[PDB]
Design a protein around this nucleic acid. Sequence first.
RNA 1: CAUCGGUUUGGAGCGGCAGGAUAAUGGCGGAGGAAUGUGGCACGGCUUCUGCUGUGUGUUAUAGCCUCUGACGAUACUGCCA
RNA 2: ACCGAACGUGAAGUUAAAGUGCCGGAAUGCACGCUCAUCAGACACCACAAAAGGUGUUAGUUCAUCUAAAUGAACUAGCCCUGAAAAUGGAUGGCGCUCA
RNA 3: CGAUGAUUUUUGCCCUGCACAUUUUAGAUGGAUACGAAUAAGACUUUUUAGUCGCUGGACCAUAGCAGGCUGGCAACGGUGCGCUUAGCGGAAAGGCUUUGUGCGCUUGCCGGCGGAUAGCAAUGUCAACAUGCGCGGGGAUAAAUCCUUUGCAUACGACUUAG
Lengths: 194, 189, 130, 106, 171, 199
Amino acid sequence: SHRKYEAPRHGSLGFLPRKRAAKQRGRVKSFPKDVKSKPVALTAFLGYKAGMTTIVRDLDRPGSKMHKREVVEAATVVDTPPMVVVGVVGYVETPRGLRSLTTVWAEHLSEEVRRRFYKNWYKSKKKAFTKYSGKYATDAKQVETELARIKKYASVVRVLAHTQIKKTPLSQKKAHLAEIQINGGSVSDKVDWA
Amino acid sequence: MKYIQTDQILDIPEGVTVDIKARVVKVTGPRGELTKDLKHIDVTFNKINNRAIKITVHNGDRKHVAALRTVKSLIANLITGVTKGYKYKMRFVYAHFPINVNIIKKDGQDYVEIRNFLGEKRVREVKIHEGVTMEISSTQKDELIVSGNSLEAVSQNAADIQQICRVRNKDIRKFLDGIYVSERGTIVE
Amino acid sequence: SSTVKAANWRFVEVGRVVLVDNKELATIVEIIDQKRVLIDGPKIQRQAIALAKIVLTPIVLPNLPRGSRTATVTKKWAAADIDAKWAASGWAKKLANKERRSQLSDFERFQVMVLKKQRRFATKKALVKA
Amino acid sequence: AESHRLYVKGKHISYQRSKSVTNPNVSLIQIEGVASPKDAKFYLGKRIAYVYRAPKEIRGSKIRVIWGKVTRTHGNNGLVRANFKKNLPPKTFGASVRIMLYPSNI
Amino acid sequence: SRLNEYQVIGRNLPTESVPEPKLFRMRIFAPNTVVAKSRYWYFLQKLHKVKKASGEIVSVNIISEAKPTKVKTFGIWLRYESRSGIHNMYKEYRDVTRVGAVETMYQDLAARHRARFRSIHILKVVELEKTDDVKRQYVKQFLTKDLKFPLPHRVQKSKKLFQATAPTTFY
Amino acid sequence: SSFEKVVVIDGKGHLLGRLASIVSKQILNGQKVVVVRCEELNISGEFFRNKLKYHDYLRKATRYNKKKGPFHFRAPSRILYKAIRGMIPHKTARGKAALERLKVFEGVPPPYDKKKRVVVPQALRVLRLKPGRKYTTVGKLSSAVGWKYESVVEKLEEKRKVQSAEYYAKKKALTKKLNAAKASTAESEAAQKLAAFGY
RNA sequence: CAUCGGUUUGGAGCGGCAGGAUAAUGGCGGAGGAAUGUGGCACGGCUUCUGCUGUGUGUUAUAGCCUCUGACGAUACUGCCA
RNA sequence: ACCGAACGUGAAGUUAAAGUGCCGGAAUGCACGCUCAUCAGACACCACAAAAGGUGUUAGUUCAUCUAAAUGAACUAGCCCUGAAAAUGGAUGGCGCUCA
RNA sequence: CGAUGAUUUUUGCCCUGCACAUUUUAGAUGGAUACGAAUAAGACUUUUUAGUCGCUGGACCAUAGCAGGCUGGCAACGGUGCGCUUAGCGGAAAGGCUUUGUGCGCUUGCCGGCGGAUAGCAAUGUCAACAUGCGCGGGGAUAAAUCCUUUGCAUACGACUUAG
Ligand SMILES: CN[C@@H]1[C@@H](O)[C@@H](O[C@@H]2[C@@H](O)[C@H](O[C@H]3O[C@H]([C@@H](C)O)[C@@H](O)[C@H](O)[C@H]3N)[C@@H](N)C[C@H]2N)OC[C@]1(C)O
């Protein structure tokens, strides 16, 4: 028999499953659509949630009852020290979706981002990226060939960047590394900016 | 019943040429050039001479044969549009509120703008199709003139204007306001 | 001028020469309906047949009256030498060459291979010389 | 030369069967290049070999054979029926067999 | 080839009242002689009050076409039974024999009217000798001067499953 | 009719179900098949009708848990795959081994862009349908029901066609030169003697 | 592998004989006829009569067709062959 | 429980009813038509459909008007369309099929 | 499904030239032989007029030699295998398509000389790619993860975020 009385569903069926997130760092599912005619720029930035506070403002909404009047509003502080660019990734269109072609890294990586590649940093020999660094030292010609690859074939260019977590009060020493998409300009301009 | 053969004759006047190849018709005349794709119909063509063309359906049923006079009329409209041109005229009809009509160029694109239709604050903008020219008549009040080489584009674009001005939630027998086609003809009568 | 590309179909019509069973020639004497024609020829039997069972050829017997009897067909056919017209076409030559190739013995196929070898030697020489 | 073949290529298609019941004692065989019963009748009585490889050497060889013979034609498309000394195992549905040219009548 | 035309001649068995009973003939379109005699008795039992047991078949003979390689137009008069009633109709066919036209008629009534063989009586089959006698435009259109027509869109039947060249439908 | 190592079918202009039945019997009998350009396949019937049919397919889903239901694949090669799998005893080991002999692709990816492609006349739309009948292109239908890569495939196919046309121009020039060379050596002793053999 | 005996499925099988309207046709010979009327001829709108073309007339002409029929000769179909 | 056929253990041959695009042994076989459906249709028992409509298309019947280039009326019955609304997602057995 | 970092001072690991040997195989046995598009259309020629072609791949390429041996000559300056080397192109899954020069062969384009037997009148009468292992040669590189303690951005327990 039918429900005796009607009522809306409890909860949304669009946020299923209600499971634990796969990673603590939240990933950007989709980036803003690229506009070639704009200047080359980053589309995202990583920070650390510090807390909340209260502010006072004058409202500017004509027709509102609070127009030209003070309002009190909650607000959130995000601790955002500058990020460090350490690499670049090129993506090619395929009939199966975006596929990463190659990854190119900077010559020097700070200890806080290199800690990201370790589960037991204190017991390791710290070998991460030590042979890669020699790909620059000779004449960097291999690095430039990889970047030329990205210019020739990629349609989407994202930069690799990490937070400077040691400028925050956090006791965590591992930095957070993320891909941030470069929008604006040609692919060649994107690679040069990276 | 599959009539063994049906034929129609295209009359091409002294100042036009008709090039047909793989059911693509290209009609050049003094006023320009028009082209129509007929790949969706199974027909064949023969050049009788420079003034006539035979259009033929072999072993066709009732509907296929019905699609032969249609082809003749479409190509004949191409001819008469590239010779005489096509002009439709629209009269602005209203009881109380005048209908403000303007031809504008937003983003390099010609638009017909209709203002104050039945006193509404909404502004209606209808895109002007390529190859079609609109014009406010300076010899008849409250009249828009729609002209071009292609009868299809001209008539569809006049229809777009007519359809954008439909009265809602009122007795349309009483509220006759609109922009209506009042004359269909050629530029060169 | 106008220049409309017309079709270059072969027509079902009296005098049209057809192949029968990929082997024998005939000519359409009369049309029964959309699907069927009466055919006759010097080396067949006069018969009504379905157009789907025969193959139209580009050759036409000229000025064959509708309904011609076997004697008339034979006389017109001999006068026009339809067989010579057919045997000169590439279609007939390809059929004849297929028939010839299917008659080879093992030893004849061996000879074909060696002759092709000599042919190929000369052809490559002329190819570089080009 | 570089081709040494003296047999005609074939495939093991199926057993004789109705919709639900199979008969392993008769195999259906497709002979390459054969499209009609008339062409297939050339091969009636020809010997068939299914040649396969086995883990264990016998007489120093890992190659083993099941011998049969073409018995009659099957259907209208040139398939044939075959009888093997031992029924071809059903895992060989789709495998290749070798139609000999002997006993020859040419 | 499905059918043959027969004459079937029969009479009542002789009695004392009627020593020489009248011979009757029917033209029958049948697959074989057994069906031909069956049809003869069927029609004789309808038309007259006679039975098979009190009569006899006198002769059964194939009637061959007079001119089997002359193109003709036939008119056929028919009585057939529909799902709903009983109707008369007249149709025209082009053929070189009467049996060919009758076979085409049976196919045509099966196709357009769902009339099975058991539902049809053949009233009369006549070779139309003057072009003015041809009444139906679906056969009349093949009786015009210098009739010629192409056969557009030819489909070639392939022996192989896979073709290495692109299809063509020219002809 | 010959046994090939791999048969590569150009899917352009083939009717879905007829090609599917032919391919199913081919792979069941031990022949490896690759079908390319599945977005160029055809289905008889107008587009709107086949779209309605696909939406009736989408309507079917396991009520108590949609994740268990039928999985409605949208890409054209998967539409052909669904047609083929329906004609295979895919729940047996032999059916699985037959399906492993099959590959289906949008476009013509490597290595098949440099290999010969064939057609199947018993399934060709231009040869099967009556000339006036309406039909659907599977690529349009897929895009209407959620396939995301119509434009990527179109761009890549244009690039492949440019490269293939340049290939063909070179092959045609070489063939013309070879024909001249063989014409220079006609009426030779070997040429005449081969002509006596039908060659 | 060969030959035999039993059962059985085939071949583009080959050949002899019989029947029928002692096939009907066709081919050949004779008489009669007409039209979806060939040649000829006349009237034309278009082709420098460069299949021009259409319409009329009438009956083999610079094509043919249809009906009836005379004497020969086959074939199809059906059946038989110890 | 219908159709076919009734059963010792086997070899070979041939069938019944039912079938021969794939699932599935056997033809994308030969042939004449009809049908296009924004709820087509698809095999007895059997897994239903009516009264009633259609200027969709096809073939027929009977009248009538026309050079003093064909058309007008009434009707018949085929396939197709409307009439045709139920509850988990789903069943011509499935795939799929449109000169099938 | 992809990109990328680092991959054990153990005699463990990577790459590479061989040689011998073992397992495996949904099933080698000359060659998977590359335009695109239309189909009431294509192509070629002269020209946009006409002619011709297809009407199946029963095609094309390859194909002779102890499963292909050993030796001689003629004509050609070609064809072809392997091997170093050169230049370009290919990112859809490129992993392939070409190309320069150069050393060792082969050539059935033509003509010779020598060998095959007895596996007995057939018996797959054994000739493949892929993988792995072991022996030599050549080079090359020299880590981490988990437990444990810790944290509380986490938590029923596992798991997770941290630090050592
Ligand atoms: C020839 N006799 C027909 C018989 O075949 C059948 O007719 C169906 C008819 O009912 C169908 O039509 C009906 O049924 C369909 C659907 C439910 O099947 C509905 O969509 C449709 O609206 C309805 N009118 C029609 N589409 C086909 C005819 N053969 O039903 C009985 C009948 C009308 O007498």
